[PDB]
Amino acid sequence: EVQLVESGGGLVKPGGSLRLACVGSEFTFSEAWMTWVRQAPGKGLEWVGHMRPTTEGGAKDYAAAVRGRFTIARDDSKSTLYLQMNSLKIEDTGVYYCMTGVERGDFWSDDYSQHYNTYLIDVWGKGTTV
Amino acid sequence: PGQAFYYTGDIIGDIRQAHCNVSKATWNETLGKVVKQLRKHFGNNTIIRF
Amino acid sequence: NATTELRNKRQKVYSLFYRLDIVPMGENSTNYRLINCNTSAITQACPKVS
Amino acid sequence: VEQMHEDIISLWDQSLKPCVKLTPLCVTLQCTNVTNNITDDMRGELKNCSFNATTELRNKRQKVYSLFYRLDIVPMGENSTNYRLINCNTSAITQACPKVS
Amino acid sequence: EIVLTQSPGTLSLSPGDRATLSCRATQSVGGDYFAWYQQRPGQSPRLLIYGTSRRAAGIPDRFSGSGSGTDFTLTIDRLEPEDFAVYYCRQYETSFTFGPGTKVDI
Ligand SMILES: *[C@@H]1O[C@H](CO)[C@@H](O[C@@H]2O[C@H](CO)[C@@H](O[C@@H]3O[C@H](CO[C@H]4O[C@H](CO[C@H]5O[C@H](CO)[C@@H](O)[C@H](O)[C@@H]5O)[C@@H](O)[C@H](O[C@H]5O[C@H](CO)[C@@H](O)[C@H](O)[C@@H]5O)[C@@H]4O)[C@@H](O)[C@H](O[C@H]4O[C@H](CO)[C@@H](O)[C@H](O)[C@@H]4O)[C@@H]3O)[C@H](O)[C@H]2NC(C)=O)[C@H](O)[C@H]1NC(C)=O
Ligand SMILES: *[C@@H]1O[C@H](CO)[C@@H](O[C@@H]2O[C@H](CO)[C@@H](O[C@@H]3O[C@H](CO)[C@@H](O)[C@H](O[C@H]4O[C@H](CO)[C@@H](O)[C@H](O)[C@@H]4O)[C@@H]3O)[C@H](O)[C@H]2NC(C)=O)[C@H](O)[C@H]1NC(C)=O
Ligand SMILES: *[C@@H]1O[C@H](CO)[C@@H](O)[C@H](O)[C@H]1NC(C)=O
Ligand SMILES: *[C@@H]1O[C@H](CO)[C@@H](O)[C@H](O)[C@H]1NC(C)=O
Ligand SMILES: *[C@@H]1O[C@H](CO)[C@@H](O)[C@H](O)[C@H]1NC(C)=O
Ligand SMILES: *[C@@H]1O[C@H](CO)[C@@H](O)[C@H](O)[C@H]1NC(C)=O
Ligand SMILES: *[C@@H]1O[C@H](CO)[C@@H](O)[C@H](O)[C@H]1NC(C)=O
Ligand SMILES: *[C@@H]1O[C@H](CO)[C@@H](O)[C@H](O)[C@H]1NC(C)=O
Ligand SMILES: *[C@@H]1O[C@H](CO)[C@@H](O)[C@H](O)[C@H]1NC(C)=O
């Protein structure tokens, strides 16, 4: 069962800070493209930021709304994704979701040709509310 | 890797059966000679059927 | 589906065959296979050799 | 002269007879520029190529990357990042045995 | 900094009918960078279609779609009661944002 579990959400008064984390299981964490998305009550899906697979270089990007306040980090030995949110505002209240993709597939080679049939397992966690 | 396979792609024009021709009379004379010699091992007043 | 120069690629090819060189599988009109596949592997004669 | 020529070639060929034939490597290779400090005379000389190789078990695959000299590879697909080894169209390549000088 | 929009706000269809959900971009998005997700209210969104037309593993065959450039569509062959959810379009090439979402209702 490929899964993501978010934790750490709660509401912190403006000007404070909160750390979220997401633990992956049953997937090579370091090969995953991890993305934070949030949804405030009554709102649609807002991109927060992401970090590319460790094995592909670990590059990051952020939504303009959180640039300079939020930090994304990973620790592969714990299969954990982190989000450090500094200088919190009321508008940061909402559900923070951890979402990634896992491509698994059945490889089968002969002596004249090889093939790899892949399938994408969309895995989202349940979300933690800030 | 450098290995080519050859095949018939298509046929131009009508499709007909391959065949061989011999002269009818030449073939009949040839058998007559064979029959004549077979009768030296078989009897004279006999029948040879092909 | 023919193999090609690279192992992770395939190509779709069609060709004409004589009926005598192929044998139906499971009485399925659509599916046929080469006669030698159950027996020993086939080798193509070199086009450069008469 | 002719005997020396033929015998050297013959011995050369015999020495490769028991060595691994690298047929598993004829796959498409995705190649990018090398992440290092390259002098002007070496720019474009090396490429960093990744590919999907077979392994000890035929139902398993591994991701491999290596550095190649540009002279050993040729572009393909749409003249972009998809390259292949030069030998793949002409013939299969044999690896020289590392124990043989 | 490409923005996606969606239409209709709400799509009203009986169960068993065919859904058509639109998404439009301000700038072109390569097909391999466009996707749709289904959010049953109260639940995490679920990927239906990725790469414009490719179905995610575990997703029913009634879900399909197509598109290119700035014009993409998600469709459902026959709506089931469980499909009266909010569908969102998401780009992930240069811009990782989502459209506003379209509710499917009766
Ligand atoms: C060696 O092997 C590897 C592994 O097999 C192989 O790499 C794969 O190659 C295939 C073929 O090119 C790629 O498959 C294509 O995927 C296209 C769509 O994928 C895009 O979207 C994916 C989904 O992401 C969304 O959803 C998730 C979960 O909800 C979310 O997190 C995302 O934000 C997003 O919303 C995405 O995963 C994917 O790749 C991204 O992520 C991976 C890490 O997971 C990262 O490594 C990538 O750089 C990238 O960031 C991508 O964004 C799909 O449209 C496409 O379909 C076309 O091609 C097929 C077949 O050719 C046609 O039939 C079809 O009509 C389309 O033309 C195809 O399915 C696959 O993504 C690669 N996987 C990886 C790991 O990158 C190498 O190429 C092999 N190398 C050699 C040299 O042979
Ligand atoms: C040839 O190509 C291969 C890929 O096919 C390439 O290998 C990759 O190199 C990158 C570095 O460019 C490696 O990524 C790092 O891995 C270390 C762990 O060993 C991490 O600590 C690094 O993370 C830090 O930096 C990130 C920002 O870049 C931060 O976000 C992060 O928090 C850390 O501070 C980073 O993840 C990658 O693991 C390898 N991949 C593989 C499979 O080996 C190789 O270097 C290329 N060679 C040449 C000569 O071009
Ligand atoms: C065979 O062809 C030759 C010419 O090449 C011709 O003279 C001869 O009559 C033909 N024989 C028959 C049986 O058609
Ligand atoms: C073949 O030989 C027989 C001998 O009885 C003769 O009757 C017949 O006409 C001959 N046919 C031809 C084509 O010469
Ligand atoms: C058979 O016929 C030949 C003439 O064709 C004759 O010479 C021979 O004696 C005959 N043989 C017998 C047993 O009658
Ligand atoms: C190959 O298949 C044919 C058709 O079923 C059969 O007659 C023949 O005996 C088989 N040969 C071998 C070596 O199995
Ligand atoms: C490569 O050159 C840059 C200067 O352009 C230098 O800062 C860097 O340290 C050099 N790389 C290494 C490995 O020394
Ligand atoms: C990659 O190397 C080639 C030389 O082969 C050069 O022309 C090109 O500009 C380089 N690209 C990048 C992004 O460095
Ligand atoms: C292999 O491909 C190259 C082009 O990259 C071509 O010049 C060469 O003649 C080809 N060799 C064979 C045996 O087809």
CB E37 within 8 A of CB A99: no
The residue whose CB lies within 8 Å of the most ligand 1 atoms, and thus the one to mutate among E39, E50, E64, E91, is E50
CB E57 within 8 A of CB E35: no
CB D51 within 8 A of CB D65: yes
Helices (H), D1-101: 2-16, 87-90
Q: Cα separation of D89 and D52, whole Å?
A: 19
- Written as six digits, the tokens of A31 are 């090969």
Q: What method was applied to determine this entry?
A: cryo-EM
CB D81 within 8 A of CB D56: no
Is A106 at the interface with chain D, CB within 8 A? Answer: yes
Is C48 at the interface with chain B, CB within 8 A? Answer: no
- C-beta atoms surrounding E26 within 10 Å: 12
CB E31 within 8 A of CB E50: no
> In sequence order, what are the beta bridge partners of C10?
C3
CB A10 within 8 A of CB A19: no
At residue A109, what is the residue type?
S
Q: Quick one: A90 exposed, middle or buried, by C-beta within 10 A (0-12, 13-18, 19+)?
A: exposed
Resolution in A: 3.3
Distance of alpha carbon D13 from the chain centroid? 19
Non-local (6+) Cβ contacts of B3 within 8 A are none
Hey, which chains touch E, using 3+ CB pairs under 8 Å?
A
- C-beta atoms surrounding D95 within 10 Å: 11
Q: Cα separation of E59 and E80, whole Å?
A: 13
CB contacts < 8 A, B to C, total 15
Q: Quick one: A74 exposed, middle or buried, by C-beta within 10 A (0-12, 13-18, 19+)?
A: buried
Tell me what percent of chain D is helix, strand and coil, each rounded to the nearest 5. 25, 30, 45
H, E, C per residue of C6-21: CCCCEECCCCECCHHH
DSSP string, A64-98: TTTTTTEEEEEEGGGTEEEEEE-S--GGG-SEEEE
Q: What angle do CA A87, A92, A97 make, to 5 degrees?
A: 120
Largest separation between any pair of C-alpha atoms in chain E: 38
> In sequence order, what are the beta bridge partners of E102?
E87
Q: Dihedral (C-alpha) A100, A124, A119, A27: value to the nearest 10 degrees?
A: 70
Q: Cα separation of C6 and C9, whole Å?
A: 6
Q: Cα separation of D55 and D39, whole Å?
A: 36
